[PDB]
Design brief:
Chains A, B: The modification ADP-ribosylarginine is found at residue 100. The structure is a homodimer of 272-residue chains. With 272 residues, chain A is of the alpha/beta class. The first copy, chain A, has helices at residues 15-29, 46-49, 57-64, 72-75, 100-111, 133-140, 155-170, 192-203, 216-222, 227-230, 235-249, 261-270, and strands spanning 3-8, 33-38, 77-78, 84-87, 121-126, 146-151, 178-185, 207-211. The structure holds adenosine-5'-diphosphate (2 copies), iron/sulfur cluster (2 copies) and magnesium ion (2 copies).
C-alpha cells in the first residue's frame, strides 16, 4: 500500500516549502516518497533536486513528439534522500486550461508504473485558488485520498481552505477523498494557532501542525535546499519532523463541514 | 467614451480593497463608475454597497430561469457615490470552470446596455492566480483595455504579475489590451517601493502608486465601507485619492516584456 496525499492551499501560502520539507523529513526517517508537482509555477521539486526548477511533462512531451515518446526515467528525477520528483507543467497564460497538464501527468505516471509497491507516500502539490479542471482532478478522480490544506490566519487563506473543503464534499459519494487536516503556516501573529485550531474544529478536522515563520527557510531556499538538508540541527527542521510524524500517525480523514462567511468573519473578529 | 480597466493580481493581494477605494475616490471626484466583479469570492462590491457581498448573475439567472429573465436593474446595484456594482459569480468548487460566470456576466452587461455613454470608467476585479477560461476573457476578448496589476514584494505576487503580463503579450496581435501599471500594496517592508519600481521598469511599465499598509482599512471594512467613505480625512484616504488621480492621468499603456525567473530572483536578492 501507499498513502496518496495532496497539499492544497492558496498561492504563496507555503505549499511547496511545507511539502518539500515534510517529504525530506519522511525520507530522513526511511520512507520512500514521490512528489508530483501540480502547480503551473513548476518549482515544487527544486529544493529536493537542488535545482532552479524541473522541466515539466508538458514541455518534455512537446519536445519529444508525444507523451508516449517519454519514459518514466526521463521524467522522474531523484534528489535528497532518494525522493522522486516530477512536474506536470501547464499551458502558457491565456491559452487553454491552466490545469490541463495535471491530467496528462497523473495519467502518464499511473500508466508507466511510477506507483511501485515500495513507495510509502505520494504527495501532490496542487494549486488551490480555483478548484476546477486539472486542479480538481486529484479530488474528482480519487487520486489523493488524504488532503492537507496549508493556511494561515489570513482571511483569504481560510477562505481557500473552505473552498477546497467544498470540493471534497462535492465528490464524497464516489472514491475515498477526505480532508486529513489543516497545517498552519504562521504569519507570526498572536493567537494564530488557536485560530486555525478553531477553524479545523468547525470544518470537522484538526490542526495537524503549527509551522512557525523562520528566516532559516529563506536561507535554505536561496541555496536550493530544504531546511532538513541545509541545517539538520535547526529548530525549524525539528518543526518539519514533528509535522511529518503527525502526518504519518494521522488517522482522522473526514468529509468536512464547510462554513459560512459569517462563521469565518466571526472567527477572525473573536481572535482579534 | 469610457475607460475600461481591469485590476488583476494574486489572491489576497488587495485587488478588491484597492479597486473599491480607488473607485470611491473617482466618484468623490465626480466620475461615473461601474465595478464588475470577476472573482468567484464575489465580495468585490461589498464596500460600495455596505453589504455582506452581492448576489451574483449566475445565482440570479438560476433562480429566475435563464439569464434572459433578468433585467439590468435586477443585477446592477448602486452604492456610495452612485457607483454601480455587479458580481459575476461562478460554479461551486469542483464543478465546471471557475471562470464560466465571467463570460456570462460580461456578455449580459454588453447586451443589456450597461455600458451607457455617461459612464467614465468600468473596473473589472479579476482573479489572477490562473489566466484561463473566463479569467482570460477580459484580455482575450478585448474587454479591459487597461490592466493594472496589484502586487507587493512577495515573490508570489511578482510571479503573478509576470504571468498576467505573459497573457497580455499572447493577445497583443488582436484588440487593444495593454498593461497600464503596477500598484504596490505594501507589506510594510524596507525598499519595497524601489523593488516594485524596478520590476515595473523591467516589464516596460511604471509603478502607478505605492499604497501603504494601514489598519484603517480593516476598521473601515469591518463597517462595510471604503476608507474614502469611512474616514475622508484619513491619510490612507489621501493615498487612494493619489492613486485615482494617477490612473486618470496615466497615458502609458504597453505590451509588457515578461521577465525570467532569474531576473525575478535577482530583484529580490538585490533589494535584500
Ligand atoms: N515557515 C516559513 N517561514 C519562512 N518563510 C516561509 C515559510 N513557509 C514558506 N515560506 C516562504 O514563503 C514563500 C512561498 O512559499 P511556497 O511554499 O513557494 O508557496 P506556494 O507553494 O504555496 O505558492 C517562499 O519564499 C518561502 O521561502
Ligand atoms: N493597504 C492595506 N492596508 C491594510 N490592509 C489591507 C490593505 N489592502 C488590503 N488589505 C486587507 O487585505 C485583505 C485582502 O484584500 P482584498 O482586497 O480582499 O484581496 P483580493 O481581492 O486581492 O483577494 C483584506 O482583509 C483587506 O482588508
Ligand atoms: S478556470 Fe482555468 S480554464 Fe477554467
Ligand atoms: S483551470 Fe479552472 S477549468 Fe481550467
Ligand atoms: Mg508552490
Ligand atoms: Mg477580491
Amino acid at each position: 500500500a501507499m498513502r496518496q496525499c495532496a497539499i492544497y492551499g492558496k498561492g504563496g501560502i507555503g505549499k511547496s516549502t511545507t511539502t518539500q520539507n515534510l517529504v525530506a523529513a519522511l525520507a530522513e526517517m526511511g520512507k520512500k516518497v514521490m512528489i508530483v508537482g501540480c502547480d503551473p509555477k513548476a518549482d515544487s521539486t527544486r529544493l529536493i533536486l537542488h535545482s532552479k526548477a524541473q522541466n515539466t511533462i508538458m514541455e518534455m512531451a512537446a519536445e519529444a513528439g508525444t507523451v508516449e515518446d517519454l519514459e518514466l526515467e526521463d521524467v522522474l528525477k531523484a534528489g535528497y534522500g532518494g525522493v522522486k520528483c516530477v512536474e506536470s507543467g501547464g499551458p502558457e497564460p491565456g491559452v487553454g486550461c491552466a490545469g490541463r497538464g495535471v491530467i496528462t501527468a497523473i495519467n502518464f505516471l499511473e500508466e508507466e508504473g511510477a506507483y511501485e509497491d515500495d513507495l510509502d507516500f505520494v504527495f501532490y502539490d496542487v494549486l488551490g485558488d480555483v478548484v476546477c479542471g486539472g486542479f480538481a482532478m486529484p479530488i474528482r478522480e480519487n487520486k489523493a485520498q488524504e488532503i492537507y490544506i496549508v493556511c494561515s490566519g489570513e482571511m483569504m487563506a481560510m477562505y481557500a481552505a473552505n473552498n477546497i473543503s467544498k470540493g471534497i464534499v462535492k465528490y464524497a459519494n464516489s472514491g475515498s477523498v477526505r480532508l486529513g487536516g489543516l497545517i498552519c503556516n504562521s504569519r507570526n501573529t498572536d493567537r494564530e494557532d488557536e485560530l486555525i485550531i478553531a477553524l479545523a474544529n468547525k470544518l470537522g478536522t484538526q490542526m495537524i501542525h503549527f509551522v512557525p515563520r523562520d528566516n532559516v527557510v529563506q536561507r535554505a531556499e536561496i541555496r536550493r535546499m530544504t531546511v532538513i538538508e541545509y541545517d539538520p540541527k535547526a529548530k525549524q527542521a525539528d518543526e518539519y519532523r514533528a509535522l511529518a510524524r503527525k502526518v504519518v500517525d494521522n488517522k482522522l480523514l473526514v468529509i468536512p463541514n464547510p462554513i459560512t462567511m459569517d462563521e469565518l468573519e466571526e472567527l477572525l473578529m473573536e481572535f482579534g
